[PDB]
């Protein structure tokens, strides 16, 4: 009956990324070394894309379709799970506990996640995930 899968979509409600839609990709339910709690490795969107209309010719379109992601180790209690699910293949390999604690490949994984998120947003899919939570 577990529903904290390695590919699900939640919203972070605590921390600097409060109210931000993220995809849980690596669930560490049975603790860890530096985080002996029930937590998860997730990849959210720090800056949502702006709405796109027929009245911009490709340039404002690219500017408003730019995506700025983030990766985070976050507690389950600070996570609010949602029924939506995101595909995790392009960055599951690049997101792991070893990629954390070290900013160089932290930014590298951020680049990979950014490329994947931009591709998946220009593709007309996962619009709820790529939309913005208003509160």
């Amino acid at each position: 009956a577990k529903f904290l899968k390695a590919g699900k979509v939640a919203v972070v409600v605590r921390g600097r990324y409060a109210g931000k839609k993220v995809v849980i990709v690596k669930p560490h339910d049975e603790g860890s070394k530096s985080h002996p709690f029930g937590h998860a490795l997730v990849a959210g969107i720090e800056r949502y894309p702006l709405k796109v209309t027929k009245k911009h010719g490709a340039k404002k379109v690219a500017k408003r379709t730019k995506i700025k992601p983030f990766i985070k180790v976050v507690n389950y209690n600070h996570l609010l799970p949602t029924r939506y699910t995101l595909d995790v293949e392009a960055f599951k390999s690049v997101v792991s506990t070893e990629t954390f604690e070290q900013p160089s490949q932290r930014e590298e994984a951020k680049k990979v996640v950014k490329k994947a998120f931009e591709e998946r947003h220009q593709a007309g899919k996962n619009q709820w995930f790529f939309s913005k939570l208003r509160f």
Binding site: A1, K2, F3, L4, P81, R83
Partner: protein, 96 residues
Amino acid sequence: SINQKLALVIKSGKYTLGYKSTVKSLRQGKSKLIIIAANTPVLRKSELEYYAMLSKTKVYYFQGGNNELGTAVGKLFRVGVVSILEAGDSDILTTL
């Protein structure tokens, strides 16, 4: 009566008391029944409903406040929500 079922569950099976514990149980998938008091705040009640929908567990609404739910569950404090993990001897999961 439902109070008798709850007392039998207390005596026989396993349960957790409180919102934090019951949310933990719903996330870990070991909770089967979630009893929510009538006077539980609507935001908390809807959050528990969403968690139960996600984890495919059954939700029962106790017609009574947290004081009455604590009295039924046998403790002398307020419980706003209880989680039933195994009934032990009652048929509370099979009923209703």
